[PDB]
Amino acid sequence: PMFIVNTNVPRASVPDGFLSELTQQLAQATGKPPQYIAVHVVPDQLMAFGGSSEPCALCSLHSIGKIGGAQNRSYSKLLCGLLAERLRISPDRVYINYYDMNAANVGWNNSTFA
Amino acid sequence: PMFIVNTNVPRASVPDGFLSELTQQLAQATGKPPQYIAVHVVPDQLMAFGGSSEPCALCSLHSIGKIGGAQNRSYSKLLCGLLAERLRISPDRVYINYYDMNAANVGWNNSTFA
Amino acid sequence: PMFIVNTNVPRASVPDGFLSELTQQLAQATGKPPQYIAVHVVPDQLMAFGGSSEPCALCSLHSIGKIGGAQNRSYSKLLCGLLAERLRISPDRVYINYYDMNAANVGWNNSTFA
């Protein structure tokens, strides 16, 4: 699975080890080995939520399987909690797009996961 | 709805109030409450369109519904117009990917829209 | 077709002519004219793959058609080949999400490709 976070929160406001924490937390949440987890944090972004420039975040979680109604509700609770605690972003100013990818549409190591 | 614009146009060329204008126009165009509109602009990017480094833009518009043949054409007319007028980018050097998201695949406020 | 690569490799490590090479190779690979190919490279990113901060890349290839099991495997060999040779990124530290887009869902030149 791969998780990306785009936020207007300053770089200096991103705690050391945040990437490591995301990796471990996602490994547990998805049940996938951490070796397969990819995390990407993009701070200092020019963005707005509801017209406001208050702290916010636009995220995405791509996974081959492990995506569904209940699971996504669970991932959101987890991720919003992490963003609220580590970056001080209000959960109601966070959007997380979930993508259930087909193995044939994910390239890796010169081939695909098909 | 969430709109993202990646462009090689410099930061200084993005006019004040641009994010604000995008939010309103999208609110109007989508028929969605302004408070739920998210906008993200990423200037100074290393990109090419048709092999050329002249001003260009790669964008995305995600929305739960309100995505379709006629609606997308209307959004494109609107958004290319804004990019041409505000960022001086030719409409024929702009790509906009539209995504009709399922409510269950959009996280927000510790849960999802399902 | 549009290709985006996000990587923690530094900007100085991206060789001159990289965007042009991607443009040409993707035109050759997809069979589409180079005039339609868009490429975007984002270096110096804050990311981890498998819990490690060694060179890695998170990419996406969007295309109207020309996406499939065998074609995607071919694109992955080509793109990982380029990332390894030009950016010194190990193929097993690269993810490429492939998206087969409907023409009606791709905006360009004030309208869509429908």
Short mmCIF file of C-alpha atoms in Angstrom, two decimals:
data_model
loop_
_atom_site.label_atom_id
_atom_site.label_comp_id
_atom_site.label_asym_id
_atom_site.label_seq_id
_atom_site.Cartn_x
_atom_site.Cartn_y
_atom_site.Cartn_z
CA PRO A 1 0.00 0.00 0.00
CA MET A 2 1.08 3.59 -0.56
CA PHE A 3 0.04 6.63 1.45
CA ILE A 4 0.53 10.24 0.35
CA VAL A 5 -0.15 13.36 2.41
CA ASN A 6 -0.22 16.84 0.90
CA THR A 7 -0.58 19.62 3.45
CA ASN A 8 -0.07 23.36 3.92
CA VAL A 9 1.50 22.60 7.30
CA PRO A 10 5.17 23.75 7.43
CA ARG A 11 8.00 21.23 7.02
CA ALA A 12 9.45 22.06 10.44
CA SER A 13 6.07 21.08 11.89
CA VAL A 14 6.48 17.51 10.63
CA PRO A 15 7.92 15.47 13.53
CA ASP A 16 11.04 13.38 12.97
CA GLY A 17 10.07 9.75 12.56
CA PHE A 18 6.65 10.67 11.17
CA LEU A 19 7.34 8.62 8.03
CA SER A 20 8.45 5.70 10.21
CA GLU A 21 5.30 5.93 12.33
CA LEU A 22 3.07 6.04 9.25
CA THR A 23 4.85 2.99 7.85
CA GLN A 24 4.41 0.95 11.03
CA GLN A 25 0.80 2.03 11.57
CA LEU A 26 -0.22 1.25 7.98
CA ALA A 27 1.57 -2.11 8.10
CA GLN A 28 -0.61 -3.01 11.10
CA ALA A 29 -3.83 -1.53 9.72
CA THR A 30 -3.55 -3.28 6.35
CA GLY A 31 -1.93 -6.45 7.67
CA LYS A 32 0.78 -6.12 5.02
CA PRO A 33 4.53 -6.46 5.66
CA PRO A 34 6.16 -3.05 6.26
CA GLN A 35 8.59 -3.77 3.42
CA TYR A 36 5.71 -3.10 1.00
CA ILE A 37 4.50 0.14 2.59
CA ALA A 38 5.43 3.40 0.87
CA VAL A 39 4.82 6.78 2.52
CA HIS A 40 5.12 10.28 1.09
CA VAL A 41 4.62 13.57 2.98
CA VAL A 42 4.46 16.88 1.09
CA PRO A 43 4.39 19.95 3.37
CA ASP A 44 4.34 23.71 2.75
CA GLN A 45 1.65 23.36 0.10
CA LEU A 46 -0.49 26.14 -1.31
CA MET A 47 -3.98 24.79 -0.61
CA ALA A 48 -7.36 25.59 0.89
CA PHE A 49 -10.22 23.59 2.37
CA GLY A 50 -13.70 25.13 2.28
CA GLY A 51 -12.07 28.38 1.18
CA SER A 52 -9.95 28.50 4.33
CA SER A 53 -6.16 28.39 4.49
CA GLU A 54 -6.24 26.95 8.01
CA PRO A 55 -4.22 23.72 8.39
CA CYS A 56 -5.56 20.98 6.15
CA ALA A 57 -4.60 17.87 4.22
CA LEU A 58 -5.40 16.07 0.99
CA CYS A 59 -4.36 12.40 1.12
CA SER A 60 -4.64 9.16 -0.77
CA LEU A 61 -4.17 5.52 0.18
CA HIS A 62 -3.70 3.06 -2.67
CA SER A 63 -3.78 -0.68 -1.95
CA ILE A 64 -4.30 -3.92 -3.86
CA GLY A 65 -7.25 -5.18 -1.84
CA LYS A 66 -7.86 -4.25 1.82
CA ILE A 67 -10.11 -1.42 0.66
CA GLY A 68 -13.80 -1.35 1.54
CA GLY A 69 -16.59 0.36 3.44
CA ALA A 70 -15.68 -0.73 6.97
CA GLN A 71 -11.93 -0.80 6.39
CA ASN A 72 -11.92 2.72 4.92
CA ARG A 73 -13.89 4.00 7.90
CA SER A 74 -11.21 2.38 10.08
CA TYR A 75 -8.30 3.79 8.04
CA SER A 76 -9.81 7.27 8.27
CA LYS A 77 -10.13 7.12 12.04
CA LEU A 78 -6.47 6.03 12.21
CA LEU A 79 -5.03 8.49 9.72
CA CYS A 80 -7.11 11.47 10.83
CA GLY A 81 -5.95 10.71 14.37
CA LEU A 82 -2.32 10.66 13.29
CA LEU A 83 -2.65 13.91 11.33
CA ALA A 84 -4.49 15.57 14.22
CA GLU A 85 -1.89 14.45 16.78
CA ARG A 86 1.36 14.88 14.85
CA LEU A 87 0.52 17.73 12.48
CA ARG A 88 -2.28 19.47 14.40
CA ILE A 89 -4.74 19.17 11.51
CA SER A 90 -8.44 19.03 12.33
CA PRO A 91 -10.01 15.77 11.07
CA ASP A 92 -12.77 17.79 9.40
CA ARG A 93 -10.15 19.51 7.22
CA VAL A 94 -8.78 16.24 5.85
CA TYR A 95 -9.78 14.33 2.72
CA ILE A 96 -8.42 10.82 2.07
CA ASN A 97 -9.04 9.19 -1.29
CA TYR A 98 -9.02 5.40 -1.19
CA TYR A 99 -8.09 3.37 -4.25
CA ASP A 100 -8.50 -0.39 -4.57
CA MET A 101 -5.92 -1.16 -7.28
CA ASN A 102 -5.86 -4.27 -9.46
CA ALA A 103 -2.54 -6.10 -9.25
CA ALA A 104 -2.09 -5.82 -13.03
CA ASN A 105 -2.24 -2.03 -12.73
CA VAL A 106 0.57 -1.71 -10.21
CA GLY A 107 4.10 -1.73 -11.57
CA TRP A 108 7.08 -2.73 -9.43
CA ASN A 109 10.53 -4.25 -10.01
CA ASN A 110 10.39 -4.15 -13.85
CA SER A 111 6.96 -5.86 -13.98
CA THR A 112 3.59 -5.72 -12.22
CA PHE A 113 2.08 -7.51 -9.25
CA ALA A 114 -0.18 -9.59 -11.51
CA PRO B 1 -14.91 18.09 -4.50
CA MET B 2 -11.14 18.50 -4.68
CA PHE B 3 -9.13 20.19 -7.42
CA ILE B 4 -5.35 19.97 -7.84
CA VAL B 5 -3.21 21.93 -10.32
CA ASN B 6 0.43 21.12 -10.97
CA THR B 7 2.18 23.61 -13.25
CA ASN B 8 5.62 24.75 -14.38
CA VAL B 9 4.44 28.37 -14.06
CA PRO B 10 6.37 30.17 -11.29
CA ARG B 11 4.94 30.93 -7.86
CA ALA B 12 5.15 34.67 -8.52
CA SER B 13 2.86 34.20 -11.53
CA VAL B 14 0.03 32.81 -9.42
CA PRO B 15 -2.19 35.83 -8.67
CA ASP B 16 -3.44 36.64 -5.18
CA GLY B 17 -6.89 35.21 -4.60
CA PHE B 18 -6.42 32.37 -7.11
CA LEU B 19 -7.24 29.60 -4.63
CA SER B 20 -10.21 31.67 -3.54
CA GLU B 21 -11.49 32.07 -7.11
CA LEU B 22 -11.08 28.35 -7.83
CA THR B 23 -13.15 27.47 -4.75
CA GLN B 24 -16.10 29.67 -5.76
CA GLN B 25 -16.19 28.71 -9.40
CA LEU B 26 -15.99 25.03 -8.48
CA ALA B 27 -18.71 25.50 -5.88
CA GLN B 28 -20.90 27.04 -8.59
CA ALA B 29 -19.96 24.53 -11.28
CA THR B 30 -20.43 21.46 -9.04
CA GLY B 31 -23.42 22.54 -7.18
CA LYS B 32 -21.60 21.42 -4.04
CA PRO B 33 -21.43 23.50 -0.83
CA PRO B 34 -18.36 25.83 -0.88
CA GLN B 35 -17.33 24.63 2.58
CA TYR B 36 -16.52 21.19 1.16
CA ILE B 37 -14.37 22.40 -1.75
CA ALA B 38 -10.64 21.68 -1.54
CA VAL B 39 -8.11 23.32 -3.89
CA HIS B 40 -4.36 22.77 -4.23
CA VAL B 41 -1.95 24.62 -6.52
CA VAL B 42 1.61 23.44 -7.13
CA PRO B 43 3.81 25.86 -9.11
CA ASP B 44 7.46 25.74 -10.21
CA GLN B 45 7.20 22.13 -11.33
CA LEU B 46 9.58 20.28 -13.62
CA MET B 47 7.27 19.22 -16.41
CA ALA B 48 6.80 19.07 -20.14
CA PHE B 49 3.80 18.76 -22.43
CA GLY B 50 4.41 17.47 -25.94
CA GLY B 51 8.12 17.59 -25.18
CA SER B 52 7.91 21.34 -24.61
CA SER B 53 8.62 23.26 -21.40
CA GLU B 54 6.30 26.13 -22.36
CA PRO B 55 3.63 26.81 -19.70
CA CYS B 56 1.47 23.75 -19.07
CA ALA B 57 -0.66 22.16 -16.36
CA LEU B 58 -1.59 18.68 -15.17
CA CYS B 59 -4.72 18.73 -13.00
CA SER B 60 -7.25 16.50 -11.30
CA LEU B 61 -10.82 16.98 -10.09
CA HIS B 62 -12.23 14.35 -7.73
CA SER B 63 -15.91 14.45 -6.78
CA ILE B 64 -18.58 12.16 -5.39
CA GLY B 65 -20.90 12.21 -8.37
CA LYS B 66 -21.30 15.31 -10.56
CA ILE B 67 -18.89 13.69 -13.03
CA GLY B 68 -20.00 13.00 -16.58
CA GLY B 69 -19.64 13.69 -20.28
CA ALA B 70 -21.41 17.05 -20.41
CA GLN B 71 -20.42 18.10 -16.90
CA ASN B 72 -16.74 17.36 -17.54
CA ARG B 73 -16.77 19.41 -20.74
CA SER B 74 -18.24 22.29 -18.74
CA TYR B 75 -15.63 21.93 -15.99
CA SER B 76 -12.87 21.87 -18.61
CA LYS B 77 -14.15 25.06 -20.26
CA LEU B 78 -14.29 26.71 -16.85
CA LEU B 79 -10.93 25.50 -15.55
CA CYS B 80 -8.99 26.00 -18.78
CA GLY B 81 -10.45 29.49 -18.90
CA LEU B 82 -9.15 30.25 -15.43
CA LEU B 83 -5.72 28.79 -16.14
CA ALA B 84 -5.47 30.79 -19.37
CA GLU B 85 -6.59 34.06 -17.80
CA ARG B 86 -4.86 33.78 -14.43
CA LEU B 87 -1.75 31.72 -15.23
CA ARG B 88 -1.43 32.43 -18.96
CA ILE B 89 -1.43 28.73 -19.87
CA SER B 90 -2.83 27.69 -23.25
CA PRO B 91 -5.90 25.43 -22.95
CA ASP B 92 -4.25 22.99 -25.35
CA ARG B 93 -1.38 22.49 -22.86
CA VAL B 94 -3.69 21.46 -20.03
CA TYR B 95 -4.83 17.97 -18.99
CA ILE B 96 -7.49 17.47 -16.33
CA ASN B 97 -8.23 13.99 -15.00
CA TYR B 98 -11.77 13.62 -13.67
CA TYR B 99 -12.61 11.05 -11.00
CA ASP B 100 -16.12 10.05 -9.89
CA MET B 101 -15.38 8.83 -6.37
CA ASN B 102 -17.61 6.40 -4.48
CA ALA B 103 -18.63 7.92 -1.13
CA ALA B 104 -17.25 4.85 0.64
CA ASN B 105 -13.82 5.63 -0.84
CA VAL B 106 -13.54 9.17 0.48
CA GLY B 107 -12.35 9.68 4.04
CA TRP B 108 -13.17 12.77 6.07
CA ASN B 109 -13.57 13.69 9.74
CA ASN B 110 -12.46 10.27 11.08
CA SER B 111 -14.93 8.44 8.84
CA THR B 112 -16.09 8.30 5.20
CA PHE B 113 -19.01 9.80 3.27
CA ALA B 114 -20.80 6.46 2.98
CA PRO C 1 -0.64 9.78 -21.83
CA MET C 2 0.80 11.45 -18.75
CA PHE C 3 3.58 10.18 -16.55
CA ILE C 4 4.46 11.50 -13.11
CA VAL C 5 7.41 10.48 -10.94
CA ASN C 6 7.78 11.54 -7.29
CA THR C 7 11.18 10.73 -5.80
CA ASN C 8 13.44 11.50 -2.84
CA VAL C 9 16.40 11.70 -5.23
CA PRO C 10 17.76 15.29 -5.29
CA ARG C 11 17.11 17.69 -8.19
CA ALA C 12 20.82 17.82 -8.98
CA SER C 13 20.70 14.08 -9.57
CA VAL C 14 18.10 14.38 -12.33
CA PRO C 15 20.17 14.48 -15.55
CA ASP C 16 19.68 17.07 -18.28
CA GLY C 17 17.32 15.77 -20.94
CA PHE C 18 15.46 13.43 -18.60
CA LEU C 19 12.01 14.84 -19.35
CA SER C 20 12.77 14.65 -23.08
CA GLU C 21 13.88 11.01 -22.82
CA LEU C 22 10.75 10.07 -20.88
CA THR C 23 8.63 11.85 -23.50
CA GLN C 24 10.24 10.00 -26.40
CA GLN C 25 10.29 6.58 -24.80
CA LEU C 26 6.67 6.84 -23.66
CA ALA C 27 5.64 7.94 -27.15
CA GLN C 28 7.43 4.86 -28.50
CA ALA C 29 5.99 2.59 -25.80
CA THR C 30 2.36 3.73 -26.04
CA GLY C 31 2.36 4.29 -29.78
CA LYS C 32 0.88 7.77 -29.27
CA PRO C 33 2.45 10.90 -30.84
CA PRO C 34 4.96 12.73 -28.61
CA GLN C 35 2.83 15.86 -28.92
CA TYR C 36 0.25 14.23 -26.60
CA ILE C 37 2.72 13.00 -23.96
CA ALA C 38 2.98 14.92 -20.68
CA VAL C 39 5.74 14.19 -18.14
CA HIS C 40 6.27 15.49 -14.62
CA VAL C 41 9.25 14.83 -12.31
CA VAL C 42 9.17 15.80 -8.63
CA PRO C 43 12.53 15.40 -6.84
CA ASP C 44 13.67 16.08 -3.26
CA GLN C 45 10.56 14.48 -1.80
CA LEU C 46 10.08 13.39 1.81
CA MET C 47 9.31 9.70 1.32
CA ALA C 48 10.10 6.17 2.47
CA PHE C 49 9.64 2.77 0.84
CA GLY C 50 9.51 -0.33 3.00
CA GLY C 51 10.54 1.82 5.93
CA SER C 52 13.76 2.97 4.27
CA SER C 53 14.82 6.37 2.93
CA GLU C 54 17.15 5.04 0.23
CA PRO C 55 16.34 6.20 -3.32
CA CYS C 56 12.79 5.33 -4.31
CA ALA C 57 9.98 6.48 -6.59
CA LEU C 58 6.18 6.61 -6.58
CA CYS C 59 4.82 7.05 -10.11
CA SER C 60 1.66 7.09 -12.16
CA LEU C 61 0.93 6.58 -15.86
CA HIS C 62 -2.51 7.69 -17.06
CA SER C 63 -3.59 6.84 -20.60
CA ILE C 64 -6.78 6.63 -22.61
CA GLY C 65 -6.42 2.98 -23.51
CA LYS C 66 -3.09 1.21 -24.11
CA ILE C 67 -3.31 -0.05 -20.52
CA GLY C 68 -3.38 -3.77 -19.75
CA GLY C 69 -1.67 -6.79 -18.26
CA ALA C 70 1.08 -7.27 -20.84
CA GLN C 71 1.37 -3.59 -21.79
CA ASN C 72 1.76 -2.59 -18.14
CA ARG C 73 4.51 -5.14 -17.62
CA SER C 74 6.27 -3.67 -20.66
CA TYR C 75 5.85 -0.10 -19.35
CA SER C 76 7.24 -1.17 -15.97
CA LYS C 77 10.38 -2.70 -17.46
CA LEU C 78 10.92 0.44 -19.54
CA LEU C 79 10.27 2.97 -16.78
CA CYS C 80 12.11 1.10 -14.02
CA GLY C 81 14.96 0.73 -16.53
CA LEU C 82 15.07 4.50 -16.98
CA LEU C 83 14.73 5.28 -13.28
CA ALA C 84 17.57 2.90 -12.43
CA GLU C 85 19.90 4.14 -15.17
CA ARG C 86 19.19 7.86 -14.89
CA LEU C 87 18.30 8.33 -11.21
CA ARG C 88 20.04 5.27 -9.74
CA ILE C 89 16.78 4.00 -8.24
CA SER C 90 16.49 0.25 -7.66
CA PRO C 91 13.51 -1.23 -9.56
CA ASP C 92 12.27 -2.90 -6.37
CA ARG C 93 11.90 0.50 -4.71
CA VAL C 94 9.54 1.79 -7.41
CA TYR C 95 5.73 1.68 -7.60
CA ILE C 96 3.90 2.76 -10.76
CA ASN C 97 0.11 3.09 -10.66
CA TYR C 98 -1.48 2.57 -14.08
CA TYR C 99 -4.81 4.17 -14.94
CA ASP C 100 -6.88 3.42 -18.03
CA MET C 101 -8.91 6.63 -18.36
CA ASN C 102 -12.18 7.05 -20.28
CA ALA C 103 -11.92 9.81 -22.90
CA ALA C 104 -14.89 11.60 -21.34
CA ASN C 105 -12.97 11.80 -18.07
CA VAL C 106 -9.95 13.62 -19.50
CA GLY C 107 -10.16 17.36 -19.98
CA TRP C 108 -8.09 19.22 -22.54
CA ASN C 109 -8.40 22.40 -24.62
CA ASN C 110 -11.66 23.62 -23.00
CA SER C 111 -13.41 20.28 -23.49
CA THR C 112 -12.73 16.56 -23.08
CA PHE C 113 -11.44 13.87 -25.40
CA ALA C 114 -14.90 12.31 -25.73
#
